[PDB]
């Protein structure tokens with residue numbers, strides 16, 4: 075089975091990760107003459123890392139999600155990606171987040187025994203603050219464009235999935251409080267949060283404080299209370 079091959083790729087890539095994580099130490103203890111070389115090496119190893127996750131073979135204009143998905147179904151794989159994220163450019167990191175969203179229900183299924191998906195919440199949250207509104211909207215659009223739509227049961231019932239959804243909504247709120255397209259996905263989201271039975275909802279890792287303010291824009295008082303109770307909102 076390839077799962078053996080995947081574990082190999084994980085070990086290969088994880089080794090690069092430890093090197094890049096050790097970089098500041100080496101640079102700090104280096105002679106000036108060595109620094110140019112240290113910097114080039116760092117660059118190529120970060121490229122290599124991204125390529126092992128999201129590289130594409132000849133004849134394809136977009137990478138296959140295969141390799142990324144395979145890695146993300148493995149305990150150490152998810153923890154590795156969490157630690158690679160901070161080293162990637164914003165554009166590379168957003169790709170990883172969009173790919174995660176596109177494949178989220180399957181990744182959730184494959185995380186049922188390990189439950190390590192939450193290790194990605196922190197780096198994704200840091201990333202979200204660096205992303206514009208078009209991006210925030212596109213990610214939410216992808217989450218609502220999965221099998222079962224417009225029902226998001228698998229996501230809402232998952233600690234990481236719910237938390238991630240709440241972080242996205244929160245950041246979207248920020249950006250709008252600075253268009254209508256954002257308003258459309260917001261309506262869908264509140265509808266879905268309103269539908270899901272409270273007993274089914276996962277316990278969110280964190281609850282953004284601006285959520286109440288966000289929901290007020292699209293929903294009346296009676297329903298607002300529902301959400302607040304449902305999500306133990308602040």
Ligand SMILES: [K+]
Pocket residue numbers: 079080083141142144145
């Ligand atoms: K792989």
